[PDB]
Symmetry: D2
């Protein structure tokens, strides 16, 4: 029900950075720099600008001190300076609030457009950015858990098909989704850069930000993040994983920052750059769709996500999902999942897999 | 208390093989050969003899067809032929039933002694074994999930200190254990070969066999086993893991064979060969003790284990544990676990970690 | 020298497959299927069609029986059916011989254009292809050395700047090159799909095909290929590596097929999809540029490459490079290389690194 | 010429435990072992640095000692009981070797210790007593992408391998693999106590010299990272040989050179040898997969270069020349030969190294 503008979509290259508001900058720095090993591009008493090992643009993550932890912006880089004008015209045709800043909203980004999009998310579009030393061969700096790239964002929104249509008009290509036989869609993944995704929609009350994901080179890098968190006696901040995803086929881990912003560590999905890339649809009751090994999805993964801000810095209204809940239909009292479709053996009814019920 | 014999203990080298009774030999072969990649030393319509990648003795595992799935023997290799006599004299002094076979109980083993030990377990001691081709450089055969060695057994027994003393007299050294602040021992690990263990005692109703463990070279090999089980749509046979152990520091996975015999895959523990190797005691309520990342221990891991046989092929009666139950004290309705000792934050009261309760 | 056409360039997605002529089809099958584990999409007495683990198009490699081993076609997939028409118009404007087949030149490809390009290489452009089962989660089939994608081609051509300009006009973006202070270019790497390259130019006598490259998930997968070749006692077919590239930063290995077609195994280069991706130039005398660890480049790597065919199936005549030879200036009698620019300590004069001269 | 088997019982040797290396510039050596390789400092002052690997509980695996001439000062083996130190003294006494006993050790963190100038001219130490330290095996907050987890072995250059082998076998070491030719020459032997492929090894050549000290990693990528880091630091000229897969031992490996040219091997994933009838493996010297399984050429410096060793007065041991055939000469020299497949001319190399190279 979001109309396709007459104005052409901006040519979006990829997800580029997120700006997160955090309440205690020093505690956040300990997490993202000391625990996770991200590289400081700039910092002061109010903000920390961080980048991954292989990045050449100024940053992939901005931590901004503020009163309420929330997503401030999720930024996509566009192909040319002119694409920023294209974005402004596009979102103005959609009737969205926009704000244009020739000098950027954060350090190391030039001409940029921020919008309150039709789903209530603060999107930024920019071309201009300050190039920095690309650390991709700085093995003298390489950590055993090195985060090498920003991979994607994941957004919680109550009506997945409505947002899917809007993102497809914007140029995102759907690669995978989760549906049921009744016709409910629970989640969709969509890309620009030729990986499984740049952003994704997860069914739930929204707008809220589900997570920001970074890549590693290898699976052992993700294991090391887990081991290091055990060493630091902060294993309570490992939310879910590590595991192998069904959707995306990536090896993964979810952890929680000091303000409960969820970060995913991700590796080794597949190439999606061909225009006829085969879509994959999974059934919601398939117990291998989220964790391929059938490990249970922790309930907080379905219920918890970050606030997002509007262009005034105020928290966006959250709308209740009315479509069926993935948690409820799979691991809730009236839910079920299977290992083999139609087989009662290896099926779970009214609880999660591996012998667990909801706490 | 089990008396220390006057007779010298047999010099035990290592765990060498297990004989498991299985109910459907073909189904078991699918699991151990086709899924897990173990190498066939000999098979007929009654037995399958299997070895790991780096083994040079005849076998590490014998699958024997029978009416009731159970452990038939846990075999230890001794240093010299004379150690078989030593084991005979030792167990006779303990008042245990023994059976001696100059030409072995299974193919590829020579002079062998089997015993119903003081804890009810069928132990075998042997030196003589038919050598086979050591496959350690046969990379043309190497699987993405290759099992390279037999690492250990784990035994369920009601009274851990009683068993521990017996095993120490036999020459096993304790490397790690789990206790509480009230004098209860929940588990102990003990070695001969200079790894964390060759066998272990887990508190519970027994005698029962908790598992047999095989090693891989690297953590990705264990990940591949999980991945393969997902592709074969048998992820319901992944019981617990993968994870990092607290006790032992090994990367691990537990899976279930067609008869529900538990197999652990294990890698990268540490060297214990010095006689003053520091013993490590973990508190039972430490939520990083079993899984270092704090992932919950699946309840079946505490309740399910294999029957064991006596020397007549009959199932050993099960003696109930009267000491506190690790399940109950950690993840049961009245249980407790912590992430940081003394910190209420990251602690769990009457439920498991990560948001789960017992199903 | 090579003019920019008025006609628009076809939109090229990525390298897609190579057709290689081989002399003994069974021996070639042993190599690509039995040794390297590629998946058969189709085969008969004359050809074998093979694909990588993550591929969904019909094939990445066609082995065609013929009298003279040679490259028959290097194929690029284009974005739309209409880009095949664009390709035809573009190459006809360049005055190149072209051949159009509505039902393709090989099985599983539809409308296709083959051209004898300005550098004498047989390029194919196509959109239409038969989709097959994407094997990306078939962990039941996954090898310890699994080849997961086709990554790139590498072409030997006498004049690198001339070929570079032509490929740039065709829409390829240079990511890295090797030059000296005199102004000779020795090699260039250029991409469409957002990795370091889809093809590359290596200075030398040509046209010849230097190699076709496949990727693995992890570095251990490349190690396994070397280990397996040692086990099969064909380590003499390991040409160079394994190693870490300076240019591209990828972990690599070069091996030789039964007809001495060179295959590279490659993993973990970086993202190049941004239009201002920084272009990296290395000095020819930098001993870390080709192997980052300073291992010597085997002489055959510079001198040997595969013949290429014209559209009639005849071998293309070789044109000699007149520009300086990378072999000669670095490891030849009058060459030199350095570890640290301007440091004689760690420099090599008139010989290779690590204590070796040319055989 | 043969080394007699003493009447006195051999000390029960557990494993290689540490090496003491004399270095010329302590700060430069610290940079290499601590900043490049990530070893953990147990103790340091301005004369010495005591270092241990990730999983070690004894005081140290390596002692760096400032001195005028870079050399091996002692190769230390831990014995099973304090009485094995007495057994070691009695044993070497009966062998007619020079011995020195210190009730309070020769270095910090070691108690009662015996040092000897052994029959092959090497400075061996035997000790039981050592100061236990924090075992860092779960300190993943300190774990490096190239983490060295254990001390694995020593490798010694000696002119007569069979003579050395017999002496080590009497000392209780068990031979696991060796390299020989069809004319009765032995070029190298590997021997263990702790149930891995080796605790020490003999390499045929002019000696006594120390060929290398080896440390383990958990995984192959950890060794790759060491190479990658050296490239990043622009010290790839200190990577001598590798990385590779060994034929003998089956281990993944790398050889690098410290500031004084002391060779360090990084090593992972050999196999279990603890059974007393562990099958022995003999490789032919001309087999081009014996040292590098992938057939990569062995660097000439690997055959010719090795560290001086000291006697008990701190003076360099005189070198005795090998008279048996040279592994370098017979495989990669002008008159050398190696094969890929025994009996196959295809994939063989005459008067040169594999992969297209000659001796520099
Ligand atoms: Ca208590
Ligand atoms: Cl998921
Ligand atoms: Cl456990
Ligand atoms: Cl290269
Ligand atoms: Cl070697
Ligand atoms: Fe995600
Ligand atoms: Fe276990
Ligand atoms: Fe290449
Ligand atoms: Fe070594």
């Amino acid at each position: 029900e979001i109309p396709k503008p007459v104005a052409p979509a901006p040519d979006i290259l990829r997800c580029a950075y997120a700006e997160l508001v955090v309440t205690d900058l020093a505690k956040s720095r300990n997490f993202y720099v000391d625990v996770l090993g991200l590289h400081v591009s700039y910092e002061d008493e109010n903000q920390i600008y961080l980048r991954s090992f292989e990045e050449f643009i100024h940053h992939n993550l901005v931590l901004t001190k503020g009163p309420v932890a929330a997503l401030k912006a999720m930024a996509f880089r566009v192909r040319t300076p002119e694409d920023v004008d294209k974005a402004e015209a596009y979102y103005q045709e959609l009737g969205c609030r926009t704000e244009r800043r020739k000098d950027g909203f954060v350090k190391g980004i030039g001409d940029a457009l921020r919008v309150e999009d039709p789903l209530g998310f603060p999107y930024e579009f920019f071309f201009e950015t300050t190039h920095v030393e690309r650390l991709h061969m700085r093995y003298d700096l390489y950590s055993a858990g090195e985060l090498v790239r920003l991979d994607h964002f994941n957004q919680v929104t109550p009506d997945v098909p409505r947002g899917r249509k809007y993102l497809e008009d914007l140029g995102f290509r759907v690669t995978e989704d989760i549906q049921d036989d009744e016709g409910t869609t629970y989640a969709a993944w969509m890309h620009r850069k030729g990986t499984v995704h740049d952003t994704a929609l997860t069914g739930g009350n929204g707008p809220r930000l589900h997570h920001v994901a970074f890549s590693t080179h290898e699976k052992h890098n993700i294991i090391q993040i887990c081991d290091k968190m055990g060493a630091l006696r902060i294993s309570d901040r490992i939310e879910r994983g590590p595991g192998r995803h069904g959707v995306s086929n990536a090896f993964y881990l979810y952890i929680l920052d000091p303000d409960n912003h969820r970060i995913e560590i991700y590796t080794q999905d597949y190439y999606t750059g061909d225009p006829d890339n085969p879509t994959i649809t999974w059934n919601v009751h398939d117990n291998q769709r989220r964790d391929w090994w059938g490990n249970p999805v922790v309930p907080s993964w379905y219920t918890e996500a970050s606030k997002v801000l509007d262009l005034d810095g105020n928290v966006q209204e959250i709308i209740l999902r009315t479509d069926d809940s993935e948690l409820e239909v799979t691991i809730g009292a009236d839910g079920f999942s299977f290992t083999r479709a139609g087989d009662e053996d290896g099926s779970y009814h009214g609880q999660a897999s591996k012998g667990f019920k909801l706490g």
